Amino acid sequence: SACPLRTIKRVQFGVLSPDELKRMSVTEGGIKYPETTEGGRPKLGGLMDPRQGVIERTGRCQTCAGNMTECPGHFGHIELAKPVFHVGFLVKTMKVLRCVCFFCSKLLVDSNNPKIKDILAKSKGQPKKRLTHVYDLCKGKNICEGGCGRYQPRIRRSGLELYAEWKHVNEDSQEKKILLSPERVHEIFKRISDEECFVLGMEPRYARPEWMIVTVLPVPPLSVRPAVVMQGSARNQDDLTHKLADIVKINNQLRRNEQNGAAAHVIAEDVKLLQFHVATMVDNELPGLPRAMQKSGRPLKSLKQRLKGKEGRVRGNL
Amino acid sequence: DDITQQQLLPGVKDPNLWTVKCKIGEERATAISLMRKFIAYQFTDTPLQIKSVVAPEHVKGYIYVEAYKQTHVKQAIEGVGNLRLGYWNQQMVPIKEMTDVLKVVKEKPKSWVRLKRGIYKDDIAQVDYVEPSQNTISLKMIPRIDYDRIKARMSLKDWFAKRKKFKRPPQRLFDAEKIRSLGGDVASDGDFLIFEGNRYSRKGFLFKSFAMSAVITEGVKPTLSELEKFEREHNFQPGDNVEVCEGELINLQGKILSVDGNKITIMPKHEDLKDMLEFPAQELRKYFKMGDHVKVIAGRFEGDTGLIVRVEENFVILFSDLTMHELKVLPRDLQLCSETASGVDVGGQHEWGELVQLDP
Amino acid sequence: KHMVDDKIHSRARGPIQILNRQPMEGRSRDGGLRFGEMERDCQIAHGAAQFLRERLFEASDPYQVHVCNLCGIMAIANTRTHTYECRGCRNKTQISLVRMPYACKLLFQELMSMSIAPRMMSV
Amino acid sequence: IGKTVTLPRYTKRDCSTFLRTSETGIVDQVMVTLNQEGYKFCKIRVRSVR
Amino acid sequence: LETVPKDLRHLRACLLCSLVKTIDQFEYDGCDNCDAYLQMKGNREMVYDCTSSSFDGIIAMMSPEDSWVSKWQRVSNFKPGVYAVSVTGRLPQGIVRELKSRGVAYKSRDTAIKT
Amino acid sequence: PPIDLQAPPRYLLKFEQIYLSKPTHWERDGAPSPMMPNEARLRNLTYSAPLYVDITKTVIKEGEEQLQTQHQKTFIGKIPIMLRSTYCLLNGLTDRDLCELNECPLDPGGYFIINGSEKVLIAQEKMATNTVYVFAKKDSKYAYTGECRSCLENSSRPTSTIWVSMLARGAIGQRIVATLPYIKQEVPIIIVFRALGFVSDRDILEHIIYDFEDPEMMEMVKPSLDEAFVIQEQNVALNFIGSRGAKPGVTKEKRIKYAKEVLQKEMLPHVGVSDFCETKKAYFLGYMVHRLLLAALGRRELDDRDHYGNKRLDLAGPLLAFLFRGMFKNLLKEVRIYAQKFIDRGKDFNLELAIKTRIISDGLKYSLATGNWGDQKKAHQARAGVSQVLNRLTFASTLSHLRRLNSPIGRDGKLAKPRQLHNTLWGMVCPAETPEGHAVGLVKNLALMAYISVGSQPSPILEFLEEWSMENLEEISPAAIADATKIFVNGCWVGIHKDPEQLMNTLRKLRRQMDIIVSEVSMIRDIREREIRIYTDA
Amino acid sequence: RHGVNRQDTGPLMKCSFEETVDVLMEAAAHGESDPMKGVSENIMLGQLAP
DNA sequence: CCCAGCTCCCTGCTGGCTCCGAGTGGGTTCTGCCGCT
DNA sequence: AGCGGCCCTTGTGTTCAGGAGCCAGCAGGGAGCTGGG
Ligand SMILES: [Zn+2]
Ligand SMILES: [Zn+2]
Ligand SMILES: [Zn+2]
């Protein structure tokens, strides 16, 4: 209340950097317990973290010390064991990958080139157009130039997996087709430079390509995924809560299989399952993939579905 | 041996390995049954063409088969109940990983644990010794003894018979004089004391043995009050000034841009140094300049803020805003935070500006 | 069967949905009528900006939040202690109160769950 | 239908069934039975003259 | 079927043969190919001293000559049977010396890495 | 099919016959009670009667030792009973009896009671099975497409839909290609015939065309022959089909085996599924191709999808039959799993413990309660709407609801063509009664005198035809087809005839006399064509 | 959706129209700012529209 | 001093993705269960 | 008694809105260049 009242002059969009997510989150060390309670006591490290908000009516938030109404939700976070592609950003990620090389992580076309200078001058304040034109040019190109002079493979998508397929690989026999991993993509994006990012069109201040890869999954507060006290004492958990529980279980399983030596194959399988779960949580309607099924075969409702269309947050509630 | 292993490396001509899903814990039985079937089938018209079968322990729910063709693996695995799920799909392990598959890796006292069921459930305990052969562990915890039961001289079997409507006793340190007054029999066996078939320590802790399955060894962490009754680490957070006490670059102060575990690998920003260095936790030290806010996360008076008039090598001195008294704390335990001390209450027992009735 | 007695319905600050604080639905629940999209558009045509604001914000789900002026994100505001803090910027003074629909707040939280920064520049 | 539930102003939470808001009438009749699982199960028919 | 272990209990792996059987089976028969040197049969103590109850994994060789995994485990020369992936411990020093006198090299079966 | 297991010991577990009791209800003491339909309504019970069967478990271990035991009246679940039906306890009760039982005599019944809620099954429309419909779809890459939703009399396998399309003009000519079940690619018709075992183009054209004096037909089919020439052997064609299969087997032998299985079982099941049905299958396929050629040349009008005579109404009979078939398959699978797991240890098992009556009972209850016609876990994949709550607002409303009809087209469709009132609906469907909402034209009602056949076995009709001058398809030679009149029975081309007029006269006389042909049977003679189609479908 | 959203109007307005999630994905990826000019944006923010 | 590759680019096609009016009143079923540990 | 898995029967299975338009990827073909003869 004491804070001065203000209107809104603009809304700046972007991607939450994992460090920013960690700083925001009140669930220090992330979340590691799929369970919600502990003998009727909401587990701090569980999904029903009291820090994240007020659980019961007439309670108060452990964080802001506010009752139901006054309390806004406070986020948590989950340190994904392995990097995971963000489904919503997948197409943009593929475009960026085609734009840069694997090794230099540099543009397949130099900024100083007259054509790219022209594109930059033309698409000022139009990062989408800038990205499309630069993507066309890098589609045209196939090597790295002050780069590594290497051969950029073609990127193919298959559901949630990406495949880099080399034609005329640099060496006599190095590799022909590789399942590119989210970790590899994240490393490439981190290696990418800020000026190259701006040329791509992504304002590095507000969106770095590496941020596109999920590493610190945000955790919506209880208010976003409220649990309803039932006529029976058994509280009913939200669909997002169940999906988060599944993701946490897979994450803990993978973390165990890492902390103790486990077959690279089972590690890959856990990574695949975690990727699928996160992708469904974001959007439970990706074609081809199986639909996340709550129980008795009733599909979940992802955030994308919440916001999708009529009867959604935007059209249905705003 | 290593040189010979080089000539023993796999090749295209050599038979391949395929992964097959299987039930959990039945790998040995499945392999033995498979061999009995193949030997029976040796004299038949269709002999199994698979060269070998592997049932590793580090891997669970999976068995590997060495064969010339997948159809050969399928034929070998057919007719096995535990391999019903596996028969639908056979995975081709890559050549590079085949060696890793064959490779195996072969490898605590005074640790805090909890119990699952029983009258001692939800009780923190400390480990004494573990016997894997017997599947039992020894836990020292705070005893739960009912004094009224001793006073009335009830049998343990009777107590268990009528346990349905009887409340469990609380946690309190064992006292021999109390039982002597109550009339119960107390026996002495060296350091330990025998009472009702149980060994009690002189201090008061109860030592008992329980099954590992009953005991909890995962997701267990004691509370500060529990540790008090029973009675390296670093505190580095973003936005804190640290000094490089050891190393070539000494007497340099940088900001904590990142945070990690054993090896923090911070990216400090030193004076007139745009570039960021790399230092581990041990090399990293927490140092602050004069006349600046400081907060103590852990210490004699934790959750306190003050200003430092000096900084000794190991005893930083600050004055608490709460009271005009000196407070010496470890520099590592000290932290820099421009934010004012929140002073949030623990357990939300009382709220700010809340009426209370100290006296009627 | 359709009789006026089974259809008459009215509301003034009744119970509200749990997910979003908007009025409940259906007269059996003492709900509120839906000021739909075409109603919004008709009011836009009328030019009744203030009435539209009342209908969609002040009469449906008025809400208040605190936002860091720097990063433009909702900040923890213990109004009791008047302790307003943004963890990311570690600041406490540059926090602004902002009135918005609870549905808008929920939308922003859901986006940030989708890992988006709908930063909120009060300047 | 005055109904209560035993808790885990004490030891009892109200779970009664009220007449639908804005409605009115007279209780036509009441029937009491046991559902498939022996639980007491009551149906009340209420008539209103329109 | 004799080479196959009789039951999953009292399992042991030879420190030299790298073969897996049960203690009773070891006493009755012993190693398929190690009988002349080990002389396991006829002495229960010899079975204990030559076989350890701690072992990691098992692989069955239907045709060691053409089995690459058998070549990797250096059990290709051995007749087909069930052989452990790795064994724990080492043979007695006296037996090592007798084997050296016999002209047969002794190699530890501890293939598993130690950490 | 009986379930056999191997641990060696082998079991048979064959079912013999069913026995259905009347609606009964048990309290805690185990007392069965006669649930008044009113009692079920009041206590939210389910008006169902327990079901029973006879089971024969024969065991063989060694020396062909038969351990045949029989368990009789094995309870297997409960079946909700449509009120006033034959097996309902109100059947044939006098009006006085109904008044005593507190049941309106005028109440028509025809609905179930699930947990005390009245439910009514809305008849669901669908394309008539075992028929050849030629549709022109210029929108697609096909000038024309013949289609047949073949389906055996009773079969857990759903209808196998086979298409025979003619590629739109534009290498040189137009080619005819068939899409088969379990095949992701079209197949040259000549290739299909050769796989069936017809290499001689003379024989193939004998099957397809019947008057070789028709250069129009014959030239129009030439391009298909040209496309499919290299494959001249049945084995080659079978290998081709196996390769085209969804998961072709590397082995040519296994590819051919898979293709042969697909042809024998998955293609035109109603024509036949047993071996040696190849001649019948080839003749039916040739007839389908002939229909396609006639439609392509305009000699025969395209079939109209909305023409109501080309539709069937799944009443509560077929719908419950489908649900029960799926559920019985599930029960058999579960019993198989249970018995297999126990016999794996050498120990025997109890079929009574193996049986889970809950499968059938709960599945029927859930389906009839939620209207989701299908497995509970496949709620979305199932089609809802069926089994609506009976509308008791008035007697007229109740009657209309009981006589309701539904088109499964889907309310979202904006095509006015299916929604439009059709001429065929005369006297069959009330032209006026229809919801005015989004579902206009899709939901209908039966005209007063309307009536829906429950189906019947065509065996007596086939026997009469055989006694008659009808000539078997295999018996006859291709030449006679041209002038003779084909005879279809539920889509099964059985044979031909030479005096269709007097044959139809005889059939109509028989039906009117109610001698061999029940009233429901329908007989049509397309005089302009040379077909006589007899339908006993439900 | 195409003709309207290809305009340089604003992510919030475009999302309110159609392809909400895709529009917001693009806005986040490119770090673009909605100038809070349009009536739809002001309505969503609950502040007096222009 | 042609010229067959080879690069670049444009056409055209196929295949994939999103949308399909607004509100209203009722009703029922369901939101785990069984095998394994 | 609590955790894990999972039933779509055809492991291989029918249409869970069909249809109407945009947009992306890729095959193909021609224009033009260029290191050999
Ligand atoms: Zn709060
Ligand atoms: Zn490069
Ligand atoms: Zn901030």
Author numbering:
A (entry chain A): 11 to 155, 182 to 354
B (entry chain Z): 163 to 269, 274 to 397, 416 to 544
C (entry chain B): 1052 to 1174
D (entry chain B): 867 to 874, 886 to 927
E (entry chain Y): 7 to 121
F (entry chain B): 63 to 69, 81 to 243, 251 to 618
G (entry chain A): 1416 to 1465
From the manuscript:
U1 snRNP is the first spliceosome component recruited to the pre-mRNA to recognize the 5´ splice site (5´ SS). Human U1 snRNP consists of U1 snRNA, seven Sm proteins and three U1-specific proteins, U1-70K, U1A and U1C.
The assembled EC was incubated with DSIF and SPT6, phosphorylated by P-TEFb, and purified by size exclusion chromatography before its incubation with purified human U1 snRNP and subjected to single particle cryo-EM analysis. We obtained a cryo-EM reconstruction of the EC-DSIF-SPT6-U1 snRNP complex at an overall resolution of 3.5 Å. Both U1 snRNP and SPT6 are highly mobile on the Pol II surface.
